[PDB]
C-alpha cells in the first residue's frame, strides 16, 4: 500500500530552491531536426537542445523503479529535445511535461494539434 512518489519529491525540492539535477548529457547536433520530444537520434531544432535520455530521466538517475507497470523507460536508449530555455533542468522538464500522442511534440512546446 506504500510506495514513494519520487516525482513529487523532486518537484518539491525544486520548489524549495534546490539545484536541478546536473550532468545531463547534451549532444552535438545540427539543430535543424524535427523538434519532436523523444526520438531515436537527436532531433533538436533551432530552439532546442538534444540530450541522451537515460541522463534526463529521474528514475534512471536515482536508481529507483519506473512508474510503468513493466518498469519500462520512455527515455533510456533515446534522445530527448528540451526547449533551450529549460535545458538547465532537463529532468524537471521531462517529468512535468507530456508528449502529444499524435504529432510527437511536447504539449505546450511544439504541439500545434489544437490550432
Amino acid at each position: 500500500a506504500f510506495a514513494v512518489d519520487a516525482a513529487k519529491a523532486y518537484k518539491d525540492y525544486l520548489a524549495s530552491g534546490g539545484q536541478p539535477i546536473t550532468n545531463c548529457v547534451k549532444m552535438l547536433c545540427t539543430h535543424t531536426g524535427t523538434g519532436q520530444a523523444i526520438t531515436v537520434t537527436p532531433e533538436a531544432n533551432m530552439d532546442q537542445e538534444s540530450f541522451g535520455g537515460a541522463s534526463c530521466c529521474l528514475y534512471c538517475r536515482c536508481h529507483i523503479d519506473h512508474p510503468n507497470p513493466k518498469g519500462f523507460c520512455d527515455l533510456k536508449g533515446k534522445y530527448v529535445q528540451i526547449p533551450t530555455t529549460c535545458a538547465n533542468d532537463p529532468v524537471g522538464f521531462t517529468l512535468k511535461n507530456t508528449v502529444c500522442t499524435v504529432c510527437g511534440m511536447w504539449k505546450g512546446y511544439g504541439c500545434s494539434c489544437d490550432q
Binding site: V25, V40, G52, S55, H63, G77
Partner: protein
C-alpha cells in the same frame, strides 16, 4: 590546416621508425580546449573520434553489434555511449560496461571488472575508454601495462568478427605492447589524437578490419616509442572546430554482408573484402552476455 579536422593520426613515416622510449613532454600540456556551451569533454572527444572513424572502411552490417568498455564516468552517466548510439545506425545493438555503477543508453550494461564480462558472440566494433587512475602514480620505467589490457587483447582475438574494428584508448603510461602487436592483425591501424584533447598523450589505437592473423609484425615496445616520438615532435593545436558541423556525422549504413565461415574458406578474395570493409564474418545468432558473480557468506 589540421585544426578543422576532428583530430590527427600518426603519420606512416613515424610508424616506420625504430625510436626509443622517451618521456613525453608536450608544449601545450594542461591547456584545455574551449568547448561549445554546455558540452562535456567526453561528448566532444567521442564525437571527434566518431568523425574520424567516418573516414575509414568500417564494416556496418544490419543488426550491428557494438561493445563499449569503460563507459562509466565519475558523473554516473555514459556520455560516450550517448555519442556512439547517436553515431551508430538506429537499432545497432550496443552493450557497454564499467567497473563502477552508471546509467546508460546502451541496450545492456554490465557493472564490474571487464574480466567478469562474458559473451558467446563475436562483435563488429569494440570501443575502450578504460583507464586506471593509479597509472598516474609513476614510480619507475614506463613498461607495458597488463591489467585490463590483457582482457582486451583476449577479447579481440576471441570475440572480434573478421572485418570488425577497434578503438582502444591509450596514453603515455596507459598502454600495452601486445595491443600494438595486434594492431598489425588489422588491414590498417593508426593512433588517433582528438583535437579537443590535443594537449594530452591520449590516443585511440584504431584497428581497421580484423583479419584474425598478422598482416605485419609490429614490435609493440618500439611502436609506443614511435608514438611518443611523434607526439613529442609534433605539437597539435587544441581545436574544437569540427564539433560545429554535425551534418555528415551519422555512420553510413553500408548494409555490409555477414557470413558464417570456416577458417578453410578465408581465401585471398575473402581477405580482400574484409580489408575493404565490405564483409563481416561471424555467426548471426542471438546476442547473449553475462557477468560472473562471486558468492560469499561473511557471517561468522
Amino acid at each position: 590546416s589540421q585544426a578543422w579536422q576532428p583530430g590527427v593520426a600518426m603519420p606512416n613515416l613515424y610508424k616506420m621508425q625504430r625510436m626509443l622510449l622517451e618521456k613525453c613532454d608536450l608544449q601545450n600540456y594542461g591547456d584545455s580546449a574551449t568547448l561549445p556551451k554546455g558540452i562535456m569533454m567526453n561528448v566532444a572527444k567521442y564525437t571527434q573520434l566518431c568523425q574520424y572513424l567516418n573516414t575509414l572502411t568500417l564494416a556496418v552490417p544490419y543488426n550491428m553489434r557494438v561493445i563499449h568498455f569503460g563507459a562509466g564516468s565519475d558523473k554516473g552517466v555514459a556520455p560516450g555511449t550517448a555519442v556512439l548510439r547517436q553515431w551508430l545506425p538506429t537499432g545497432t545493438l550496443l552493450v557497454d560496461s564499467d567497473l563502477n555503477d552508471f546509467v546508460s543508453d546502451a541496450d545492456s550494461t554490465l557493472i564490474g571488472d571487464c574480466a567478469t564480462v562474458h559473451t558467446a558472440n563475436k562483435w563488429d566494433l569494440i570501443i575502450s575508454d578504460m583507464y586506471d587512475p593509479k597509472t598516474k602514480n609513476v614510480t619507475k620505467e614506463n613498461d607495458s601495462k597488463e591489467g585490463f589490457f590483457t582482457y582486451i587483447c583476449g577479447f579481440i582475438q576471441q570475440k572480434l568478427a573478421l572485418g570488425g574494428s577497434v578503438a582502444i584508448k591509450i596514453t603515455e603510461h596507459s598502454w600495452n605492447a601486445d595491443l600494438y602487436k595486434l594492431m598489425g592483425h588489422f588491414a590498417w591501424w593508426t593512433a588517433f589524437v582528438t583535437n579537443v584533447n590535443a594537449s594530452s598523450s591520449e590516443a585511440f589505437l584504431i584497428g581497421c578490419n580484423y583479419l584474425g592473423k598478422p598482416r605485419e609484425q609490429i614490435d609493440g615496445y618500439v611502436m609506443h616509442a614511435n608514438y611518443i616520438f611523434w607526439r613529442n615532435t609534433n605539437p597539435i593545436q587544441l581545436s574544437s572546430y569540427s564539433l560545429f558541423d554535425m551534418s555528415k556525422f551519422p555512420l553510413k549504413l553500408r548494409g555490409t554482408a555477414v557470413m558464417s565461415l570456416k577458417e578453410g574458406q578465408i581465401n585471398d578474395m575473402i581477405l580482400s573484402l574484409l580489408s575493404k570493409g565490405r564483409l563481416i564474418i561471424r555467426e548471426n545468432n542471438r546476442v547473449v552476455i553475462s557477468s560472473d558473480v562471486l558468492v560469499n557468506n561473511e557471517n561468522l
